[PDB]
Amino acid sequence: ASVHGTTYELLRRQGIDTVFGNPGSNELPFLKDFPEDFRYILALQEACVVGIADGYAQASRKPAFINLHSAAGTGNAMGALSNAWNSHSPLIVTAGQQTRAMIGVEALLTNVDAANLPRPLVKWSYEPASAAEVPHAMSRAIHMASMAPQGPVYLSVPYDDWDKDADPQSHHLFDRHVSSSVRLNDQDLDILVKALNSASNPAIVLGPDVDAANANADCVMLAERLKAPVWVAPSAPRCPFPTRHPCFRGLMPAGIAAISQLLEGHDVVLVIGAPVFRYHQYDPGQYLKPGTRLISVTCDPLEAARAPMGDAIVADIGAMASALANLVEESSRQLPTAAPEPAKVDQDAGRLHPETVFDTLNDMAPENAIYLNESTSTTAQMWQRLNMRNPGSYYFCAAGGLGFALPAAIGVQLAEPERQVIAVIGDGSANYSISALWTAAQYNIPTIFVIMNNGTYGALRWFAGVLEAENVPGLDVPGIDFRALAKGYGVQALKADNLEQLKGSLQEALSAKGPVLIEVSTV
Amino acid sequence: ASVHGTTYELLRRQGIDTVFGNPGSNELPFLKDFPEDFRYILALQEACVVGIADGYAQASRKPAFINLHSAAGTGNAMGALSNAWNSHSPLIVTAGQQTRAMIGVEALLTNVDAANLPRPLVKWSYEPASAAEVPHAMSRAIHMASMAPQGPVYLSVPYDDWDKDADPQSHHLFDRHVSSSVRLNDQDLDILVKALNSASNPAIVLGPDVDAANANADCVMLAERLKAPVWVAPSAPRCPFPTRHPCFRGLMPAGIAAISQLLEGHDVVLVIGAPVFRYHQYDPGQYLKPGTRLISVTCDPLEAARAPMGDAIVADIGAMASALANLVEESSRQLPTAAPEPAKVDQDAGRLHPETVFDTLNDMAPENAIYLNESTSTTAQMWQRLNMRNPGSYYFCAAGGLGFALPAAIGVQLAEPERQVIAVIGDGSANYSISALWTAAQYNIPTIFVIMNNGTYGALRWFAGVLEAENVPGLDVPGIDFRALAKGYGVQALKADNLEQLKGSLQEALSAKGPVLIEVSTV
Amino acid sequence: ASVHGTTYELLRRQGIDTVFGNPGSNELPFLKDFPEDFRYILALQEACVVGIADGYAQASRKPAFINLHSAAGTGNAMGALSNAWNSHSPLIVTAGQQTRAMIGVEALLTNVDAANLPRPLVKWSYEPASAAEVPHAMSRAIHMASMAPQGPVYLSVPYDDWDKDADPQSHHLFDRHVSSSVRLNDQDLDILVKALNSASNPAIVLGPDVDAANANADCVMLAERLKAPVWVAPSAPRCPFPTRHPCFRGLMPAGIAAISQLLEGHDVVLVIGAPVFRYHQYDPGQYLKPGTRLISVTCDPLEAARAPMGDAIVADIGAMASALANLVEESSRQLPTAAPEPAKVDQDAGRLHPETVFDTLNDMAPENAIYLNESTSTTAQMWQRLNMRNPGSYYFCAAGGLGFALPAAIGVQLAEPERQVIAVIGDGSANYSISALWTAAQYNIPTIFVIMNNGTYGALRWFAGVLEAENVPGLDVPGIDFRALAKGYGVQALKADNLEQLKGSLQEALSAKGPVLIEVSTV
Ligand SMILES: Cc1ncc(C[n+]2csc(CCOP(=O)(O)OP(=O)(O)O)c2C)c(N)n1
Ligand SMILES: Cc1ncc(C[n+]2csc(CCOP(=O)(O)OP(=O)(O)O)c2C)c(N)n1
Ligand SMILES: Cc1ncc(C[n+]2csc(CCOP(=O)(O)OP(=O)(O)O)c2C)c(N)n1
Ligand SMILES: [Ca+2]
Ligand SMILES: [Ca+2]
Ligand SMILES: [Ca+2]
Ligand SMILES: [Ca+2]
Ligand SMILES: [Ca+2]
Ligand SMILES: [Ca+2]
Ligand SMILES: [Mg+2]
């Protein structure tokens, strides 16, 4: 069999049936005779291709396969890979290389020093030394992406390799099963459980890896047994806990001093599935106040190594969450009281306050809706106003790289056809991956995009305010008609200048049978 | 003085007065108190930022300064850097890094292993070890970008460095002058000149570095003295010779066998300012046929090293071109006869043949117009139908990375306010950097964008045809309304469905006082 | 023809006839059927292999070819490559890789991510994508190493490639000639010459690249014409000027303040072939005092970029030195007076003062002797006491990496059979590459090794003294019998405990017909 046939069989046998890409000439030999049981999802720019694959992978909880064009295609996708790295997204990125006969002369489209291009944003990067090695290299890519800590991998393949004969021994790769579903040994696990049972005032902090492992329900049980408040680690890329559960305490502020102050009084703080800690603003102070012991369970050695305080256990989040939830004793402490409902902000008949938008979305959206957030100055309000009861209900660019939510919303909707996806995106952020709209229109993926139009890079004007920075250029983005942009890409567009219109537009959008974009005029 | 003040003085003293960027929080400390004698050009996505800076640098023939946001901003610009590498574009790319106090914990927005991110697409990449080193590092960046062979450089700067005190000895950096304007020593130059004077049937092949050095006029003189035909090296990123000059022979096909066949009979082939050779399609054969001696003058050691045949001289193109043009004897051979005018293709009243579009542009555009090409399946026709008499009249993505022409056209227009820029872009290519349109509208840069709409990735369907590849998915891009996209970004839009409309639209576009986009329905 | 035959023909045609190496299994396929016109020089450890090749290349002024074993062999040679990088040594380092069929499974002896191993100490690093590409890759290696700025390159080759068929078009590589013998254009050169003719008190500073280019004589003429004092740039790896010439001023101290103080009063300082400046100790102060203008001529863009002051011209040192020496006017100023003879230090009948050793060597050694220095605490005395009239008379580890002089002395002696090589090495430094002695014995290369035995890492005890550092462990190296070590490797050994014995031992050593090691007891 050819390398082409062998490789598609490998993919199919490993559960991959979809290719997200933007084609090029070095990739034609791979894409020809495309298998009938496969599905190709085209996007117009590489950041969009990867963003869609990313949302698809995160929501489906399985690896996504991507095919890009040489160095330029790969380069266009590197901002998206920064987010994928931080979110532990299992992405298999393949790029076509020039024919081996012309790599040396560096003919046009040659990806020079290929493996180094995507570094340091990949777990593994490689270009095979011969055509017969391709299936084996593809196998390595699949497993490296899937093993904890999951992350993106890169494989460059010269286009002339596809038609060559594959090693007949490649059949051994087809059904390989690799597992990293491990947990702390019995003896040490018993010690940890005892420390938890003995704590007088424990607190639990959860990160994105909990939602990735679908360990949400196990963490709820753990929180209920320990009768402990639960916080979501700062700069949260996903939501790991039902936001209206009595133990829920909200999103932690992303500052050193703010967090230690928040945890003061808690003798034992158990952090699960999050780095310690994804701070953002520089808020100097103590990492932890005296009297607090921190224990971290992470699926990533890099996270365990860099934590500036506490103990750590490197293991599978799902396996650990399940073990802990079943072994801890039920505390006789009283279960925490639920946080009160957020207040209603005064809303006149003019432009909409973000709070109003979120309250309305919470009112009108189905209970199993999935939200994506790329409205940077309104994140805190969004977290307090949306009741997200189920796992996989929230996504936000893990590395803070804009251009994620719009395409990712399409990938998530593709992965969860029965849950309405609603992406809330700022007018500034909307531009980074605007062409992704075309993919939703073409495949009729019913994502709803809500553009928060305030005409400025709000979050930046805010930091520009703290630093007390003046005369900073480039903070405003006036003159963009989002309805026209949506029309350009074949997506139905609506406008909301006030509350009445907002409610009407949402009613229509929710009843639509295709993707819809709503431009909202915000304060 | 602070690092901030010292750095802006360094830039100003080295001739930089414009910053192309997309702001972020790590960059606010650098951008605050923005100098009044500077100019900030905002673009909505990083590929667009770099593309604009690239066009500006290439057209002005001086380095362009760029400021991006951390890893995500840098990553979004890597496809654009692939083109910049191939075009020897002097680009100074700076990105903001997290505060030194939080780099270790990898707070959000930390650019991890920063210097490795842009590799291998940069000449030099670096992150200073202390704040006082910043001005010196900036100096290194400026010079590394400007010395032959020119190319992009990268500098990552922690945001807390800007307000620190600079080394008082930094003043020594302000007026440093670095030169690489060198040419072959007298003795060896005399030998080369003798070889040229002795040739019986010489041919000259010119590359992009000739136009970059503005050595066009010197090459015309050289060609006239030697009475030799002149070809433009394959995959041409720029036009180095007047296309209607009697010696002009056109664009060389990008294949090994095709080129050796084309050069057969020429005893001495002098290649100036081009790699040997930027092949594209695999057209196996002899690199050179017996009887042909090839001599290459390149400004790049990497080019000299990888040439599979001939001798090479590594030197400044301008200095070499000038020396050769003045030292060679006037041959008694007859000057080559000009190529005949291309034929008029039959055009009915329906959709436009690309040939018709180019003939019409040639008819109506000013004689000093500048063209950008990102209509991949029509490159050969474009080269035969446009009379480009002046230097800096043509640009095409040097690494074949789409998303270059649209933003680059804006940068070129900014650099040459008195020459009408006309970008000819395919409907597929238009999407990669569509948001750049906003920048033209906002600063009122009068670029004319001609979108060749044929609804498909034409060049790919063509390769898919040669390889005799079937069942290749993702080759069509239907359902895009370019007039709506232009409206979305504030740019006047026109449509041309036939010749009559094409002529009318061009008349209007040429008389416009701002940017204009014309969607052309092509066959 | 096979890749094996084609490659040896390429090497032979490019002037390479010697292979320096330490064999391994991945290299057997390359070494088999070793050409009869070639010469293989075996060394017992890789640092020794590279050190010998380095000395050979530096002294012969042509590239040296090296063959090492996979990652371990390459790794053992990386300290030696650090020196080669700093000395601009043209070294072609090749390493054998596992068979392509087993690279993927990482069988024993696989060099993983090969090209990244030697970085950042190489100009170019690469592993071919196919066997037919090997000759072309070898060609690139040869030229990259030879073009200015010269430096080490690395090529990894899977062992199964050698027996495959080579591309018949590879014959084009055989006689390629690449030149970088360039100099500043006429107009700018005239400006520089005028600045030199107009200077009232010029000073000249020379670096290692002057000796590498054999531009010594041209610099003497330049100094005599300008009637200017000449200094050797700090941390000198080579000697670029006759040390007893009336203009000679000695080795510059390696400190910022010390150098500016030394140059004070000189209006124009011309630096040729040296970085600006290879400082060592931290001696904070002004880089240059007011009134001094510095102009640097360097063959390295990296040097021009990082200079913290002055203008720079990037060009070939030989071409530039020759041009300047012939164009400057003869100044009417009086020629500088020669420095007085160094004083005789008092020497009793006990252990030898380093000054005594150097005076005696100067007295007894032939006038065309070549010295290598790796006696770190005695460098200043050595420079003042040895009259070195000819080019290529001195070598010192360019990156300060010990283990250079002993093997390099063998390589230099091999390159210059008619000039007596005398390596002066400290007892600490002698151990790093002690096994190199075997190579001298086996091929009967008559190098004389003088071991300065003082039982301690003297230079370190000295820095430990300045820093006023106390309780520093590991500074003494007692209990080493160098005569026994020499005997172990087959080299004649002598001992000198006092002056009488020193003179006697030197008389014998100079008359020897093979390598000799003299252990000298120093204070
Ligand atoms: C790729 C990328 N480029 C630039 C930035 C810097 N940045 C962070 S927030 C922001 C503002 C986003 O504006 P918008 O989406 O309109 O939302 P707002 O702040 O107004 O809520 C910008 C440009 C970024 N994080 N990522
Ligand atoms: C960043 C990038 N992505 C993908 C490609 C692959 N590619 C080469 S030509 C091409 C078609 C461009 O289509 P279009 O601009 O409509 O012009 P046409 O071929 O129809 O003339 C594509 C997608 C590329 N070279 N660069
Ligand atoms: C590979 C390497 N290891 C360690 C050092 C650090 N070092 C610099 S000088 C020195 C002392 C050398 O001792 P010796 O050769 O006996 O000479 P002395 O200082 O006594 O004159 C040492 C160990 C070095 N420069 N290179
Ligand atoms: Ca409500
Ligand atoms: Ca906004
Ligand atoms: Ca005409
Ligand atoms: Ca098209
Ligand atoms: Ca004497
Ligand atoms: Ca010693
Ligand atoms: Mg990289």
Swiss-Prot record, chains A, B, C:
Pathway: Aromatic compound metabolism; (R)-mandelate degradation; benzoate from (R)-mandelate: step 3/4
Disulfide bonds: none
Cofactor(s) required, per the database record: Ca(2+); thiamine diphosphate; Mg(2+)
Name of one Pfam family that matches: TPP_enzyme_M
GO molecular function: acetolactate synthase activity; benzoylformate decarboxylase activity; flavin adenine dinucleotide binding; magnesium ion binding; thiamine pyrophosphate binding
Positions contributing to Mg(2+) binding: 116-117, 119
UniProt remark on cofactor binding: Binds 1 Ca(2+) ion per subunit. Binds 1 thiamine pyrophosphate per subunit.
Stretches the record annotates as Thiamine pyrophosphate binding: 376-459
Gene3D superfamilies reported in the protein's UniProt record: 3.40.50.970, TPP-binding domain
EC annotation from Swiss-Prot or TrEMBL: 4.1.1.7
InterPro entries the UniProt entry points to: DHS-like_NAD/FAD-binding_dom, THDP-binding, Thiamin_PyroP_enz_cen_dom, Thiamin_PyroP_enz_TPP-bd_dom, TPP-bd_CS, TPP_enz, TPP_enzyme_TPP-bd
Protein family according to the UniProt entry: Belongs to the TPP enzyme family.
Subunit record text: Homotetramer.
Name of protein: Benzoylformate decarboxylase
Record organism: Pseudomonas putida
Originating gene: mdlC
